[PDB]
Design an enzyme around this catalytic site. Sequence first.
Site, PDB file in Angstrom:
ATOM      1  N   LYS A  84      -8.693   7.174  15.087  1.00 42.10           N
ATOM      2  CA  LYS A  84      -9.242   5.895  14.649  1.00 42.10           C
ATOM      3  C   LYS A  84     -10.695   5.742  15.084  1.00 42.10           C
ATOM      4  CE  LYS A  84      -7.452   1.458  15.589  1.00 42.10           C
ATOM      5  NZ  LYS A  84      -6.575   0.332  15.167  1.00 42.10           N
ATOM      6  N   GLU A 109     -11.231  -6.323  24.979  1.00 37.87           N
ATOM      7  CA  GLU A 109     -11.338  -4.886  25.185  1.00 37.87           C
ATOM      8  C   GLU A 109     -10.816  -4.466  26.553  1.00 37.87           C
ATOM      9  OE1 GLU A 109     -13.884  -2.898  27.155  1.00 37.87           O
ATOM     10  OE2 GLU A 109     -13.942  -4.676  28.438  1.00 37.87           O
ATOM     11  N   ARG A 110     -10.112  -3.341  26.585  1.00 38.76           N
ATOM     12  CA  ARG A 110      -9.882  -2.662  27.851  1.00 38.76           C
ATOM     13  C   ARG A 110     -11.138  -1.885  28.226  1.00 38.76           C
ATOM     14  NH1 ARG A 110      -5.180  -1.129  24.900  1.00 38.76           N
ATOM     15  NH2 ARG A 110      -3.441  -2.544  25.367  1.00 38.76           N
TER      16      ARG A 110
END
Lengths: 473, 118, 84, 52
Positions: free
Chosen positions: A158, A184-185
């Site tokens: 992705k 977001e991580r």
Amino acid sequence: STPITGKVTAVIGAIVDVHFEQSELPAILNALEIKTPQGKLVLEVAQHLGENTVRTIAMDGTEGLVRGEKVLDTGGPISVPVGRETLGRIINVIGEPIDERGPIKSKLRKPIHADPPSFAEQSTSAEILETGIKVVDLLAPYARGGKIGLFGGAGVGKTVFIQELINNIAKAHGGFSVFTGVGERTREGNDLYREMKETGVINLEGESKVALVFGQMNEPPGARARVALTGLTIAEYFRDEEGQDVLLFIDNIFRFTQAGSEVSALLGRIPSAVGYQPTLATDMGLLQERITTTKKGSVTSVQAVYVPADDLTDPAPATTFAHLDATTVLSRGISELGIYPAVDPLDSKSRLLDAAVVGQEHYDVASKVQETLQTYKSLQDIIAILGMDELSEQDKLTVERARKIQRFLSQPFAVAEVFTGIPGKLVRLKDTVASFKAVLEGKYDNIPEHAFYMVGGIEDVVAKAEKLAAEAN
Amino acid sequence: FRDEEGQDVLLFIDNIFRFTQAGSEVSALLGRIPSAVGYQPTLATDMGLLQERITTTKKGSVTSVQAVYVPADDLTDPAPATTFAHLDATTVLSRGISELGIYPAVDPLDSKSRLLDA
Amino acid sequence: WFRDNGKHALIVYDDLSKQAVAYRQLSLLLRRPPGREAYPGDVFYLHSRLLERAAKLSEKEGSGSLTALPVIETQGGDVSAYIP
Amino acid sequence: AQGYAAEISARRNAMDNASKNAGDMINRYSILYNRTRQAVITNELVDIITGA
């Protein structure tokens, strides 16, 4: 201008109450900067409590905040630096570059809460952008100014698909790109930034192709809510300044909607019991209204929603196909076969794939390809079960044509030259249609199946065929 | 009609649950603390006077025929559950029989009356 | 402390569910507006801030890493609730 | 005799199928039971933080 200033009265966790003077009260969605020892903190207004006091939401932690602290009013919404100087730079929700690359030398700062366009200006014209990869621009062609998205897992490519999309848009359309980091991580964010740098598409000393706006979700919910807003602002400024069909990359709609729901919960709103989210209507609608087509440019948001274990809980991620105009699913099954683009042609549908939208020949080619692939899998079941013999000659023709089409879907990515060392190519939409239809009628059946593998364009197909017939055969 | 005229009154009250629904309606804006599942706290009392004003006296009789709309077909809802105890003859129109083909839908078990005597 | 000193450390955030309920009790007792499942909307803020501390730093910071292993004591296997 | 043996073998197979149906029905309905009983907790949470 008068020096508008305020005094902190309450700190409701992330929420901060500031008392202003008469006529010095800023409106809502207005940045309020406070000088702090750990950098710069600003707060946007969302509620006016009264008695010259305005309830605000912080874009960062409120550590060390004291009652009576001076609060400076910017004058409008949270202005963020805009321009080509923001490309390839990590810029937070507030606007300060957090890439440790120095200050952003931008000449303009467009407010995040810009006025959305009117209904009369909502252009209903449906035309298809040329991406640079045949499978996406043909099977599920991307709507211009619409809401397209990516639905893939982990390890299917992705992120590298995002890299190829932004590179192709930068080279074919000549338009830059923006990727948002809502919810977001930080680990995957650092990995994405490292991959972005190593692909050589954001030359730190040279030209950058993506303005990677990025907001950590360890910050209060307002920062997550408005990082999408500032990414939208960057995309809108690029569209309105340069004649570019820039594409926008939302990393997840679900994270933005959950951030909005907790922002509402802190502000004093509540969802319904046993779990249901209708509160997002204002923010989700405004975000959609910020992604339309203007006369000079356009913004095509990408909803790269990661699959939540085949279970979409919140209403906005639930049945995304309502908001989707071109679905681009990245399934592991196609990548298992070795096809580098993980786009599943059967499950990648587009609402703009119509005769009167993309074209008569485009629609005919896409429909024929989809039917051939459906027959291919249907006869592949019996090929695996009863053997290849239990199959008719017309079924043989359909199977071989669809197999050639499927192996043709594998095309090089210009960002994978370091990941796997492939000569990345940028196909043309007309060339894509010509090659796909040429494969369709069967005039290229004599071409070996391996030639259809790992190529882009019919000219490369015949080139690989003659190379195979000259080196191996 | 029952007292002055001395005649058997065939009172046909339609959707009596709407009385309790309107009681909860006004109760939310009256400052009353909501009862279980959000109903009005005074549901039992006010419906008690309303229903007990229907009775068979010496002057005459009022044969009240009430239809109760049970929310979500949940018979444990406080208003229909208390209407069950505040009523002689019960005729439950279960949806599970209504869609089964017997649209009369009178569930043959919870539909009980005090006249079931030898 | 170990992560920034070049050493490797492991943090195991055992039973963070009761951490969530304790912060919910603190917020509800502090006039904070209740959110989903009566949890305040900033429990996600708290958990993000806590779990982003544990990370692998670059070799510039001594290559120290902090490893996080929380658990969520859900009931009935329903992790569809807001905090899980 | 062979018909009796086949009949009781098919009886074992049919009761095993019924046992599998009971097992998966019980699994899904126990998930539903847990969901409903947790929804009771959500309802008591909401009416306590609204009433009190």
